[PDB]
RNA sequence: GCAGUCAAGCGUUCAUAGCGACAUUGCUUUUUGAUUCUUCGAUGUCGGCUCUUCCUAUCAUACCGAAGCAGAAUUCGGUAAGCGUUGGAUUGUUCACCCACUAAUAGGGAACGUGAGCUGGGUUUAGACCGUCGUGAGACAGGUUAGUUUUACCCUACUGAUGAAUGUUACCGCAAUAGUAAUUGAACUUAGUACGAGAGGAACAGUUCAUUCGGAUAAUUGGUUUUUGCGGCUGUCUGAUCA
């Protein structure tokens, strides 16, 4: 049992929850949820929506 | 199954009825395929014969080298962006549909796979893991 | 000292096994009269792993490696990982590689001096595989193809190619490798040699539908008919 | 003429009626074999159905592809406060059918049992009883007789009991009452071990173990008065048509003039008597512990019941059955379950399981996390918190 | 259109493995007819769609008997209607014939089942064009195009839902009668074994998956969104910020 993390949102991701993604050159996406799913076949940044890790992380929020 | 099908295969969802057209990612030429029909299929009034993942199909190239057109030949079905549900949990889908293009045993026409190639494929099928890059 | 074995009814060997001087590997299904034929032939002499890598009966299309390591994608579980760091030696050493391209089976054919890797990896890997394989490495394709693992079976002594290759493509690669080329066909005539069959000094196994011509040359070729 | 095209029926014809299940606990229409060379045990047991969640557990079942992996499984979990004795009864062959010649109460009842019996509860002087349980004022000589007479003559003995409803996050203060027939040997020792448990409780694990596979019987969820096309699952018919395209066109022949039991008609739907078989047990919990759902990999203390607790049931506080699949009724219903009616192999069945991990996280949301200690572990502190 | 009886004869010889000519004896109401018994103070006419059920004259599956059956394969018969029998291109088409799958893609009945169930492509009004025919109005072994598809609330039947009288009232049951379901295929093994000069090449048992059907159920994935739940955006109005 290995706990992956979404590469959208930075969610953990326990088995059985939400869904991959294999684009065209392979590379593989793993989502937590529907809501992560969609924003990014919306070509949303991720670095740009307010409370994913990755924006948090540029932000520096939280990291104290 | 029959000619060429290594063990069972767990059923997954049924992405790409009769008249589907999918990219075909070999290099023997052909553009696209034109699935005609499903090797092994059930037989319900109303229901269109459908493929999946790994299935076996009855093929014609509309976009290909003339050579390879106006003829019924047997495909395999190599992706299909219909999500299915493996065992270890995951759903999973890829970005399009596609297929290879090869004979009732089961050899392949081309000699090579562009992208991916699900593992429901790649096992159940020795000669397209032969072929295959990038394995999921 | 060639054999004819089917897994199953499979007539391609290649895929289901991997045999290198230090260590075999076979696939977890179906009858050992499968089994039976490595070890009749090796004896007590090497290990022989039953394992999935990533789940998939195949594991030569999966892994690429010689006697000094192996190498494992990505997708290969962790608690089948184990399994095989423990019954093979210690002195083979596996490091588990990230790359777009996940079967390294078809990508890299390599022997313990040689290796030869698909175009389009990565220069990350090349390095990696350096340290790993322990060997040199050349980006070829054989005759226009692609996968080069599939398509050229090697070992130490001297190796094979598919037989649609062009003579100055043999004649150009074999001061590559350093071993003799030889154009041929396996398992009533199918082009993919490396699939088909597994070698290694000492032994060689190939599709039981392989004609008796094709044997000999797999036999000559291979050095196995001792000398 | 004829079908012209010929295909299989639209439903199926053993399970009608369709009507409404006549009471929302469903009967136990036959129990085990009886088996006189074991101990005397109970052959069924109550429970009320908290709701599902995931699990994953390592796959060995020799020759699968997926033998030797872990799998994600769903899992219903029924809730067990542990059962009580109020009573036994004998019955006895006759030419027209197994017939109850006399019944047999225990002294002390509870409340919630004496509810039963009620209507109007809160109008009520609440005497039921009260007349027999003044039969013990003497030595006994009255019920002991009748025991006696259960002991000559009662070819089965079926126990009364009562489920405890005070310990369950449902808000009915009126108990299940059931009988439930036992296997063990001598209709003489169970009459005995039956005088000898009144008014005690029994529990799960003296009845369900690890591993086996037992029936699920409950009423079905109620879905109301149903039109043919989602109750028999008929093809919608084509856009065009007038007067509506979700029927069944033809209803007959001219001939028989008369509509037939067998076409399909619209009515009550879903409310039924259903008993689905083969289920195997995951786990059977204990009531006071922590860390039911952990496992020997997991080893973080945590409970079966997922943050925020079951939706629309409560938290498990209790003993429980957990079960592997889907069973009928829903959510706060009242499920009997059953020992299995033949033995098995199956190879599926047989097999020992060991639940590599449990899903504790929220089912009123997408739930991220686990525990609240997961939670506050990822997330950090927020403005209200420290 | 279907089933027997005699076997003149085809088949390496061999009437009955497999047939039958000459003819004779029957069955069939899914052929076409003949008659004109009921209906013209109207039984709504083709086909498809939808859906149920029965027959057996068995296409597949089950178990059997036979061969001029080594195996493999196929063929003929036996009990047998339990369960199945499909997706399409062309056509209004029933029929048919082609493509591909299938274990198989059998034949029929029920007012040529079924329009207060649909549809309205066909025939078959009134409009119009052509070809032949007629002096003409007009006619058609014809071709073509456009053309209103009504009603249930009644009685039964069916499907679901209550219910008086069984001294009152509550709980736990029994089980008469009725209905009843699963299905079929492939892969690994057995085993490259048996049979066989060879070419080729099985099966009982066991095992992993699958097709059609059925019953539930909603942890996960998906769909749905009047939680108008939260955010975004447009035009305008409340004097603007805000709401």
Known sequence: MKVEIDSFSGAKIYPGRGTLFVRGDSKIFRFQNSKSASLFKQRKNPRRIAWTVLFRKHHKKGIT | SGNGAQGTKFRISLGLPVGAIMNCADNSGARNLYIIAVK?????????????????????????????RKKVMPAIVVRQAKSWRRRDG???????????????????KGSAITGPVGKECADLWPRVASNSGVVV | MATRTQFENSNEIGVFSKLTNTYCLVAVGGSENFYSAFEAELGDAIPIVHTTIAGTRIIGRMTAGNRRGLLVPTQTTDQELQHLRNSLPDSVKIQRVEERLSALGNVICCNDYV???????????????????????????????????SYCSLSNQGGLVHPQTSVQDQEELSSLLQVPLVAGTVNRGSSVVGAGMVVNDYLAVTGLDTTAPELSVIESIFRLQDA | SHRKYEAPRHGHLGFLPRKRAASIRARVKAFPKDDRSKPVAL??????????TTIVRDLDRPGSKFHKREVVEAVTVVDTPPVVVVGVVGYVETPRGLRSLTTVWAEHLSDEVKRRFYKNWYKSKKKAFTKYSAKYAQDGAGIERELARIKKYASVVRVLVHTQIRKTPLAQKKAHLAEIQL????????????????????AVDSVFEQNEMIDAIAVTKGHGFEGVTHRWGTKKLPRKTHRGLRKVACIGAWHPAHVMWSVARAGQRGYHSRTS??????RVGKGDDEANGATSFDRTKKTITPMGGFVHYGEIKNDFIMVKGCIPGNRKRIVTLRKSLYTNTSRKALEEVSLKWI????????????????????????????
Not at chain 2, 102 to 108: D, H, R
Not at chain 3, 124 to 140: C, K
Not at chain 4, 369 to 385: I, R, S
């Open chain 4, 277 to 282: 078989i083969n289920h195997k047990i995951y």
């Open chain 2, 40 to 68: 092994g299929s059930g037989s319900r009034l109303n229901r269109l014969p459908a493929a999946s993942l790994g299935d076996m199909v009855m093929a014609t190239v509309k976009k290909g080298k003339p050579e390879l």
């Open chain 4, 183 to 202: 296997n063990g040997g001598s209709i003489s020792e169970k009459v005995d071990w039956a005088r000898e448990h009144f008014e005690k409780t029994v």
């Open chain 2, 90 to 108: 995951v759903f999973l889908y890829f970005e399009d549909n596609a297929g290879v293009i090869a004979n009732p045993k089961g050899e392949m």
């Open chain 4, 43 to 52: 052959t069924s047991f109550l429970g009320y159905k908290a709701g599902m």
């Open chain 4, 359 to 386: 899903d504790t996280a929220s089912k009123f949301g997408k739930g991220r996390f686990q525990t609240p200690a997961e939670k506050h572990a990822f997330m950090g502190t927020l403005k209200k918190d420290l």
């Open chain 3, 115 to 149: 290796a030869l890797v698909h175009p389009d990896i990565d220069r990350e890997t090349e390095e990696l595989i350096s340290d790993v394989l322990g060997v040199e490495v050349f980006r070829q394709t054989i005759s226009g193809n692609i996968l080069v693992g």
